[PDB]
Design a protein around this ligand. Sequence first.
Ligand SMILES: O=P(O)(O)OC[C@H]1O[C@](O)(COP(=O)(O)O)[C@@H](O)[C@@H]1O
Ligand SMILES: [Mg+2]
Length: 221
Amino acid sequence: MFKAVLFDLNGVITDTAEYHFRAWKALAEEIGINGVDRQFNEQLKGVSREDSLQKILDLADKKVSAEEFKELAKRKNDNYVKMIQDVSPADVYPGILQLLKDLRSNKIKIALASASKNGPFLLERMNLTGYFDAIADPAEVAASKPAPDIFIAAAHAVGVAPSESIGLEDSQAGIQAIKDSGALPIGVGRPEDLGDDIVIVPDTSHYTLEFLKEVWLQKQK
Ligand SMILES: O=P(O)(O)OC[C@H]1O[C@](O)(COP(=O)(O)O)[C@@H](O)[C@@H]1O
Ligand SMILES: [Mg+2]
């Protein structure tokens, strides 16, 4: 049997992409950059805080000091944090709470493999802290998804190898990170947003323990 499930946050447990988007747009508008719209934000989502800012700057051919850059990222983050203060248990994605209950009931480890440093605060706001055996710290890994580092760390933080793990992701960079960790990906959403040679479910109501076990057995050799 698998021993752990490694969860993405945004796209799987909940999704705060709207707040990330609004904070980025607000920052761009403050510094006088045109074109940070919903279509552009598709380039931003599965990208890090620093890489997101850089893309926005590049869009304007705007150069900043290293100090300026840190200040702009902080400003966006401070604004984003304000927006997520009202996140509640009602923002947990369909089926997720029951899955976390069933995993814990079966003594399968639960770990967060988010690229977001606001991950722990969001789990608290959704009242999910207690279910998480560990939270990989994206500030203590050498690279963001699609590097496998965060999934490797997530697995290790609960005492398992990725090979003994299922990863749950919603993005291309996320799916690739899981693959390269050696864990088994199951994607949620549309194929073109996920990747190939994986099991995909259309929405998180399909992530049940029964399904995860069946997929596990299908993928063992
Ligand atoms: O890995 P997840 O849970 O999908 O979160 C993805 C988000 O994490 C980030 O890379 C960084 O998040 P923070 O800015 O909250 O630290 C965002 O740029 C991206 O939208
Ligand atoms: Mg995601």
